Amino acid sequence: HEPLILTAAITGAETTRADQPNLPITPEEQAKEAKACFEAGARVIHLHIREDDGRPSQRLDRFQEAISAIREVVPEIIIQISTGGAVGESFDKRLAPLALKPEMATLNAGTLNFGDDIFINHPADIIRLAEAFKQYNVVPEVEVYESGMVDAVARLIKKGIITQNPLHIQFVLGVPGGMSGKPKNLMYMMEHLKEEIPTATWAVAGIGRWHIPTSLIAMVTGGHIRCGFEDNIFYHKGVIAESNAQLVARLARIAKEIGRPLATPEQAREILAL
Amino acid sequence: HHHHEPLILTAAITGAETTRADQPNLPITPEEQAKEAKACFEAGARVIHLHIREDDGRPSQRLDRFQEAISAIREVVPEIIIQISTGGAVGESFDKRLAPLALKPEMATLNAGTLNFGDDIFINHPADIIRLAEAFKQYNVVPEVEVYESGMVDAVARLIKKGIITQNPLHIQFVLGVPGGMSGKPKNLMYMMEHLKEEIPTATWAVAGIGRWHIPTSLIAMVTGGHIRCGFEDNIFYHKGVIAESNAQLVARLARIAKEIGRPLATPEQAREILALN
Amino acid sequence: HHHHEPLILTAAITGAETTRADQPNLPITPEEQAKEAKACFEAGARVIHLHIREDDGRPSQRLDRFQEAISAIREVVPEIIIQISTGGAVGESFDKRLAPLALKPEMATLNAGTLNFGDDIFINHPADIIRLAEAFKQYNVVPEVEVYESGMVDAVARLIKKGIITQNPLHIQFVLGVPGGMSGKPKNLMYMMEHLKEEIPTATWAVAGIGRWHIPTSLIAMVTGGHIRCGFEDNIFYHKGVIAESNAQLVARLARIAKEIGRPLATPEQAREILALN
Amino acid sequence: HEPLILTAAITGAETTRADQPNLPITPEEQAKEAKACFEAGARVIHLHIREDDGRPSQRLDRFQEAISAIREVVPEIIIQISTGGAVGESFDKRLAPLALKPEMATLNAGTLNFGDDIFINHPADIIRLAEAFKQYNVVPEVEVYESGMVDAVARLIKKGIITQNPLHIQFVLGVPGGMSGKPKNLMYMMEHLKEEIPTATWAVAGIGRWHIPTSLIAMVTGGHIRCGFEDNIFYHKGVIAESNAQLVARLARIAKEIGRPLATPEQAREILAL
């Protein structure tokens, strides 16, 4: 019965147009998808940007273009920019777009092996990013891939480095190298978070095949849900999705079947302390 | 992966306690139960969990009335599995609860313990559990073992060790949300499936969520390989404060959610195979 | 951190079922119980969970005999907390189980549900649970609420919501390992403490592990802030196949383990504060 | 009732002689400590080496000296060499001592932030180390700091990269950056491992204040236990330990109190598939 906030992670850094022909790459494509997602029930867009050639971008001008396009089509949507970017990107380039003063942005809470590579978040870089969030008055969404990252975040809170309260945690489950999205895991994580950061709220992203199991557990445990091509390009096993909005709409339908209302924009901002 | 695990839906259409005053759509007579069973089957149900009533709504244990209901359902929907309750109504004698196994249904419930049950006690004395287990062997009926608490899993495992229950694979029905029993919160259903895997590794399972626990138990079962029971016996509401129109309406919602997520419904043949009814 | 959580040890010295034939060292008479209570206190126990017996070993509920035992224990060890059982023996009437609250002990048990209990049923009808809860208020006695299954936690939480139990903080005693109840495996004790934290956030807890579950429950409790019950009522063996020499021997082992790990034993004053007995 | 294998991690890479005056640094000191630990109940020594000045070493000659000294005092002990070394050490230097053909050695299963630094185990380096274990016929002890590392190891098993069965996993709990040693966590990890790698055996190391909680849970769940100055220099809060053997002996006493037998050398080798 608690409202449900749906996030659409519409582009990401890695997904190709060859694999997912409906992948939005340009600001205009991203705005069109954001409108469809909003109408389907999404209240947050998790935003990565691309150059026209499809390579990942960290350019401030390009971020401003995408943010402006999305805002103009759906002024009420929450635009959450990524500070993760493409694995391997320099930390300075990942941090810089906070200067655009978005409403929300991601804050990655640890390092992990990530497929064939390593997604690096050095402890000193986490601290400097956390300080930049404060300086630009941006509300973090803290990305957690493993149990230990919750404790790490709790220590940064204790030290006064992360002062946001309530803090919003995004469990990102199913990375090869990170915690999987099996139900035991999501239950463990929400309970672990409740022990360590009792006032934190949470959402879950389930990569690939973990999208459905994470979503259905979150539905009935008060959690919020992320979906989209950044995490999963398939609507069913072996069946490419038509759009990010198709993925959002399924979650909206399930919420309607079970009687869990979707958050209004106002409710989403209240819950996320925006 | 859920795309490869057939889902068995059970409709517990009548029960012992639900009233026509609370749920105007409650099926009471054999004819009414047959009609509802057919609609439930068409909506995706493969098992009916059957209690019977007299025409005036009183719970019954009579063998003639059980046969009337069984035959009515079989005549219109022979494909569905008719699972007889041996739990019956509040305070019923154990003799009357056991007797209908002599009708040789495909399946019947075997309650695995005693618990406080609302304002009363649902009594299953250890010696009676044993004689009921013996009756399942005598009459060649497959049990569905009803579990309301952790310790009932251990109790069943002891009966298996003692050779009192030899059915393998054994089917366990978690019944969660009784006032006096374990609730249907997600932590609990996760705990129970994992506990069952430790104690009875080859057992299969279903969950029934009483009242407000219907939705949480169903969605967890969807994505953990469990099977799902619904129906007026357990829950008369489609949403909080919104009475369900029929048992089939409840079944159809579960079928729609399964279809959304790509989990196939068991065919009658698959339901019988999974439950070891052939 | 365990170095800062006092540990309350309870000795359940006699019980209703344990026999002198199995355990030659079992204390039966008030004098024997007093001697054992003193030795247990010296070994680290702060609470005695008291059942009484007639001289021939039969379980008793008589108020004159309860007063005799209580007084005998108080005379030699006034510091120990004497917690009266209201569970009593197999099949005992609820009237006789309730009556000793009129003796106004510091603490008494309040059994939170019915369960199969070995070959019998331990009956706690919902209406009787309520009238016992009412008696705790009438006689100004603090309850220790005995929980054998998950659903009993929910039942207690409902009585708190209804204002039937107003004791706060409430002390819960998990009793794990009864045949018919939840076992004392580590998964279970972890689940139960976490479930209790969700449902009754301010409750404190202890664990009793019947038989082979004594060691697993004790070591988990040591490092999770729980308190620990031991004694012949629950377990007559020091090791598998090795009879315990006394209840104090069991208490002393727990005290030694606490000392090894640096967890302090509660003083009598701390035990009373924690249990809200002042 | 199942036998208990105690491991003594006697030296490590970071502990100083100033903080723990009884820290063994030289091969001779390490041999003396190993004998005392063996007599107290230890069946495995987890071995890091130091130069005489106390800096961490990866020199093959120095490893051979330590291995020889320990072997000569207690021929029956199992000598498990570390391939973790000091955080920041080159992977080539970490891998090289496998050429000495020890009975067992550690195999770190992932990257994590580790205090102020990052303990790096690139996916390609994990693979090459796993292949070297096979080439030198060394049995791994696989070090796991987070849930996701279990899945990662399971994938390497599926691919035939890790073929050891039964595989021995060491949960290392309490690193700042890794999973903590709280009871919920250890219970979760043993159950998660049972789901993902059903025939694996396990031990736990609890860093610092997590030594006691991890040990007592392991005692009664069939797990094995690591202790020692590498992980914890305190016998009680604020009370420096006298020796690694003191730490081992407490665990032996608790095992004796509860009736869990210590593994004989033969039993330890059987359990660990040596």
Ligand SMILES: [Mg+2]
């Ligand atoms: Mg399109």
Ligand SMILES: [Mg+2]
């Ligand atoms: Mg010395």
Ligand SMILES: [Zn+2]
């Ligand atoms: Zn992203």
Ligand SMILES: [Zn+2]
């Ligand atoms: Zn029924």
Ligand SMILES: [Zn+2]
């Ligand atoms: Zn008692």
Ligand SMILES: [Zn+2]
């Ligand atoms: Zn090491």
